[PDB]
Design an enzyme around this catalytic site. Structure first.
Site, short mmCIF file in Angstrom:
data_model
loop_
_atom_site.label_atom_id
_atom_site.label_comp_id
_atom_site.label_asym_id
_atom_site.label_seq_id
_atom_site.Cartn_x
_atom_site.Cartn_y
_atom_site.Cartn_z
N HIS A 33 46.46 -22.74 124.95
CA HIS A 33 45.19 -22.24 124.44
C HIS A 33 44.46 -23.30 123.62
O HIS A 33 45.01 -24.34 123.22
CB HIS A 33 45.40 -20.98 123.59
CG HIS A 33 45.89 -19.80 124.36
ND1 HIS A 33 46.76 -18.87 123.82
CD2 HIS A 33 45.62 -19.37 125.62
CE1 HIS A 33 47.01 -17.93 124.72
NE2 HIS A 33 46.33 -18.21 125.81
N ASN A 37 44.97 -10.45 120.48
CA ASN A 37 44.78 -10.70 121.90
C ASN A 37 46.08 -11.19 122.52
O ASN A 37 46.65 -12.20 122.08
CB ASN A 37 43.66 -11.70 122.17
CG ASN A 37 43.25 -11.67 123.64
OD1 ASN A 37 43.29 -10.62 124.27
ND2 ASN A 37 42.91 -12.83 124.19
N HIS A 83 54.10 -14.74 123.23
CA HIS A 83 52.64 -14.77 123.18
C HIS A 83 52.07 -15.33 124.50
O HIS A 83 51.06 -14.84 125.02
CB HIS A 83 52.27 -15.60 121.93
CG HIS A 83 50.94 -16.26 121.99
ND1 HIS A 83 49.77 -15.63 121.62
CD2 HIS A 83 50.59 -17.51 122.36
CE1 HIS A 83 48.76 -16.46 121.76
NE2 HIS A 83 49.23 -17.61 122.21
N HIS A 132 51.38 -24.55 123.39
CA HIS A 132 51.02 -23.76 124.55
C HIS A 132 49.60 -24.18 124.90
O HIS A 132 49.10 -25.17 124.35
CB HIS A 132 51.24 -22.25 124.33
CG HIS A 132 50.23 -21.54 123.47
ND1 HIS A 132 50.41 -21.32 122.13
CD2 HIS A 132 49.08 -20.90 123.80
CE1 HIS A 132 49.40 -20.61 121.66
NE2 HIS A 132 48.58 -20.34 122.65
N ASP A 171 43.49 -23.23 120.56
CA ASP A 171 44.03 -23.54 119.25
C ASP A 171 45.24 -24.45 119.35
O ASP A 171 45.82 -24.83 118.32
CB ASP A 171 44.35 -22.25 118.45
CG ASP A 171 45.33 -21.32 119.16
OD1 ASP A 171 45.51 -21.50 120.40
OD2 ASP A 171 45.89 -20.39 118.46
C1 4YJ Z 1 46.29 -14.06 111.14
O1 4YJ Z 1 45.03 -13.53 111.53
C2 4YJ Z 1 44.68 -13.60 112.91
C3 4YJ Z 1 44.25 -12.49 113.61
C4 4YJ Z 1 43.91 -12.57 114.98
C5 4YJ Z 1 43.99 -13.77 115.67
C6 4YJ Z 1 43.61 -13.84 117.15
C7 4YJ Z 1 43.76 -15.28 117.63
S1 4YJ Z 1 42.50 -16.43 117.77
C8 4YJ Z 1 43.50 -17.68 118.32
N1 4YJ Z 1 43.11 -19.03 118.69
N2 4YJ Z 1 44.76 -17.24 118.40
C9 4YJ Z 1 44.94 -15.94 118.05
C10 4YJ Z 1 46.35 -15.37 118.10
O2 4YJ Z 1 46.59 -14.18 117.77
O3 4YJ Z 1 47.30 -16.12 118.48
C11 4YJ Z 1 44.43 -14.88 114.97
C12 4YJ Z 1 44.76 -14.81 113.61
ZN ZN Z 2 47.59 -18.73 122.05
ZN ZN Z 3 46.74 -18.46 118.53
#
Ligand code: 4YJ
Ligand code: ZN
Ligand code: ZN
Length: 231
Positions: free
Chosen positions: A85, A179, A148, A83, A87
């Site tokens: 984003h 988020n 997501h 996707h 990451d």
């Molecule tokens: C497993 O622990 C966590 C907790 C919260 C997050 C928030 C973020 S930041 C990012 N690049 N993606 C996310 C997502 O949820 O997809 C990511 C991992």
């Molecule tokens: Zn994402």
């Molecule tokens: Zn993510």
């Protein structure tokens, strides 16, 4: 034992062997204050390797390629972002400079453009409708519909019954939805079921962040979604 966020300093990457010729990669990055971990996939593709997603940034992604070179020793030749984003495309320019052919759905490409993120070079045809799938060398790419995010993909590795959920599948320890700005909480539960449907056989499911599992990760996500639809 799987690596956890507190064991991976920002700028380092870990490779973790899942099955014969299947590894995950794990890195860490800050976001809205605080550091989170993040997963991707590496699948052998004959004498080359196929990269599923960046290591969430240019520096991480450079260190990924270097770990790969040190530990596996076959060239990375293609990558697929699941996707739009950071990451998932953060580090596509490093990949490109390294000589990796980068790929993504047309919708993922348009959305990275709008967001100002890095944009993979090649469009993946044939992934427009909920339920489409295409064979990308050793894997099958599959679009379960919005979750997501509206574009998010998952990948399945036939020969090993590994299913890569991307940020569409949470890890059990995770109970807050976190988020969901670009999400469609409405279709999300349906899309997970679309996954369960097409990949009943998955013996190993990998979320976009945190610890791997079995098909149970599908249902746990669902609950955590609905618990937020409600309130
Ligand atoms: C497993 O622990 C966590 C907790 C919260 C997050 C928030 C973020 S930041 C990012 N690049 N993606 C996310 C997502 O949820 O997809 C990511 C991992
Ligand atoms: Zn994402
Ligand atoms: Zn993510």
């Amino acid at each position: 034992e799987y690596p956890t966020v507190s064991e991976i300093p920002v700028g380092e990457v870990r490779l973790y062997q899942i099955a014969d010729g299947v590894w995950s990669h794990i890195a860490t990055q800050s976001f809205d204050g605080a550091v989170y971990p993040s997963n991707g996939l590496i699948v052998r593709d004959g004498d080359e390797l196929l990269l599923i997603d960046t290591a969430w940034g240019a520096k991480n992604t450079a260190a990924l390629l270097a770990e790969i070179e040190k530990q596996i020793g076959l060239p990375v030749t293609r990558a697929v972002s699941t996707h739009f984003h950071d990451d998932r495309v953060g580090g596509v320019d490093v990949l490109r400079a390294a000589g990796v052919a980068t790929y993504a759905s047309p919708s993922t490409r348009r959305l990275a453009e709008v967001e100002g993120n890095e944009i993979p070079t090649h469009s993946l045809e044939g992934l427009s409708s909920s339920g489409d799938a295409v064979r990308f060398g050793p894997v099958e790419l599959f679009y379960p519909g919005a979750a997501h995010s509206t574009d998010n993909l998952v990948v399945y590795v036939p020969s090993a019954s590994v299913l890569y959920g991307g940020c569409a599948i949470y890890e059990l320890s995770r109970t807050s939805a976190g988020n969901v700005a670009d999400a469609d909480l409405a279709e999300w539960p349906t899309s997970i079921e679309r996954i369960q449907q097409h990949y009943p056989e998955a013996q190993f499911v990998i979320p976009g962040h945190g610890l791997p599992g079995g098909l149970d990760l599908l249902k746990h996500t669902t609950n955590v979604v609905k618990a937020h639809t409600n309130r």
